[PDB]
Amino acid sequence: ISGKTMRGGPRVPKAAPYPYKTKKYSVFNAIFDKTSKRFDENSKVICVEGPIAAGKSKFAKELAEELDMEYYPAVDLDLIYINSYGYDMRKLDPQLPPSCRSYDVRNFCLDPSHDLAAQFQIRMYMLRYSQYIDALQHVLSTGQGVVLERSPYSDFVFMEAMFRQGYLSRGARSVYNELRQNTIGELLKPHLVIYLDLPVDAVKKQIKARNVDYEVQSKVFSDAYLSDLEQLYKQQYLKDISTHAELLIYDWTAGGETEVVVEDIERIDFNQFEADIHNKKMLDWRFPLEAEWCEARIKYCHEKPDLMNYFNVPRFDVPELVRSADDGKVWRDVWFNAPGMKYRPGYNADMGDEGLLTKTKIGINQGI
Amino acid sequence: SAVNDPLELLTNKGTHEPSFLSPIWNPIACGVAGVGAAIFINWGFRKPVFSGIQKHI
Ligand SMILES: Nc1nc2c(ncn2[C@H]2C[C@H](O)[C@@H](COP(=O)(O)OP(=O)(O)OP(=O)(O)O)O2)c(=O)[nH]1
Numbered sequence: 269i270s271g272k273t274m275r276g277g278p279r280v281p282k283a284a285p286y287p288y289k290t291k292k293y294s295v296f297n298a299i300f301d302k303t304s305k306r307f308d309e310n311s312k313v314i315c316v317e318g319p320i321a322a323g324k325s326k327f328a329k330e331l332a333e334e335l336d337m338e339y340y341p342a343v344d345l346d347l348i349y350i351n352s353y354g355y356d357m358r359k360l361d362p363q364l365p366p367s368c369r370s371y372d373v374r375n376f377c378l379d380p381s382h383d384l385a386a387q388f389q390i391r392m393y394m395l396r397y398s399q400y401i402d403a404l405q406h407v408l409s410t411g412q413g414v415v416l417e418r419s420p421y422s423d424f425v426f427m428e429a430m431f432r433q434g435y436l437s438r439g440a441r442s443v444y445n446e447l448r449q450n451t452i453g454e455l456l457k458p459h460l461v462i463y464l465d466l467p468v469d470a471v472k473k474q475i476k477a478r479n480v481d482y483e484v485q486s487k488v489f490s491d492a493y494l495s496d497l498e499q500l501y502k503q504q505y506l507k508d509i510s511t512h513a514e515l516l517i518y519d520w521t522a523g524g525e526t527e528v529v530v531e532d533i534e535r536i537d538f539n540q541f542e543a544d545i546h547n548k549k550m551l552d553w554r555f556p557l558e559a560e561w562c563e564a565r566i567k568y569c570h571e572k573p574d575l576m577n578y579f580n581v582p583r584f585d586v587p588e589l590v591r592s593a594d595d596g597k598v599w600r601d602v603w604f605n606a607p608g609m610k611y612r613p614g615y616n617a618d619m620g621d622e623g624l625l626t627k628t629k630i631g632i633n634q635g636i
Numbered sequence: 637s638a639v640n641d642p643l644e645l646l647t648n649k650g651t652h653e654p655s656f657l658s659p660i661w662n663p664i665a666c667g668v669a670g671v672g673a674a675i676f677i678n679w680g681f682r683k684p685v686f687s688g689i690q691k692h693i
Binding site for chain 2: 611612615617624625626627628630636
């Protein structure tokens with residue numbers, strides 16, 4: 269990793285960027301277009317983790333604009349509840365049954381003890397897992413490194429944090445652990461992890477300084493929930509990720525400086541871990557052949573429906589994650605008769621689409 | 637004929653007229669099968685069933 273200040277300009281790509289959002293990458297595309305020809309020192313996956321009030325979007329934005337990488341924002345549940353046409357599905361809440369209504373993080377902030385919350389965290393995992401592969405498709409196909417505000421490796425910390433406060437049952441822990449044991453072994457671990465360290469009182473101070481209308485007057489962010497998550501980070505997630513990823517603890521109780529952490533990143537030698545073949549650090553990115561590199565690119569640019577179909581675990585013993593059949597029927601009749609999702613995206617003529625009589629272009633990795 | 641000759645049973649005299657559907661049944665049944673297969677493809681992908689009529693043609 270080399271910054272823009274020492275390099276004296278923007279980085280140059282070693283090859284042309286592959287249009288991974290338009291063209292598929294099968295083995296017959298992998299014969300011609302190689303994938304290790306566009307890799308350099310700025311092809312790392314950096315996850316900037318921290319507490320909930322630490323500045324991570326601004327820091328990840330300036331790190332992406334400083335190290336010449338792409339900033340991937342934090343996931344929020346507007347990605348499900350707003351479709352591709354821009355229609356909000358929170359306006360279908362009176363039509364939906366109350367056991368199948370909308371549950372965003374605002375509804376968690378006022379009502380954390382609701383039965384949908386055990387669904388909600390799982391939904392958050394289904395947006396982190398869907399983002400990281402979308403991060404990995406940017407690493408393997410274009411060569412540009414990515415930086416993520418949140419990672420699916422760190423999402424279990426919030427799961428035990430809602431468990432310890434009492435918002436989750438033991439069955440919700442069991443089904444999230446089954447989903448994690450089913451899914452977390454299929455995606456590559458990041459190269460570098462930045463933990464922006466904050467004490468428990470300064471998190472509350474930044475929360476009341478932000479003055480977001482659902483963070484204030486909420487009983488979720490007490491002195492036990494924040495302390496539980498900051499303890500649980502540093503003694504479960506950091507200890508798990510330090511075996512593979514480099515771990516950088518930064519005292520973010522002040523405003524925080526950007527040039528010192530770019531200096532701290534730049535002195536890290538990334539080639540010393542490739543000397544040992546069986547080294548635990550950077551084991552997931554150690555591909556000795558071009559065929560293994562192309563197999564790794566195929567696994568995320570072409571086999572993303574497989575990794576999204578790996579969320580198909582049946583666990584019916586929990587009552588708060590089973591949608592009843594009449595409620596599921598009226599949920600289908602409301603949700604799939606919406607103006608946005610009557611058909612697949614790009615083929616809905618009710619919301620201003622033309623030329624459908626001669627259109628047979630499905631798309632790549634599109635949710636149906 | 638008063639004999640049950642085996643050779644004249646297989647010999648085509650030419651008095652059997654083919655039906656109206658006999659020369660034309662298989663192309664129109666396979667055309668309807670192809671149109672229904674394209675409609676089935678468009679239904680399985682949640683496309684409109686008559687979207688992309690070039691595939692049907
Ligand atoms: N239940 C639950 N809540 C979550 C989860 N992830 C985040 N949250 C909630 C807790 C907090 O209210 C808030 C966390 O804030 P963020 O991590 O998005 O940081 P914030 O945007 O405040 O600052 P930043 O963008 O990092 O500068 O969202 C999760 O997985 N589950």
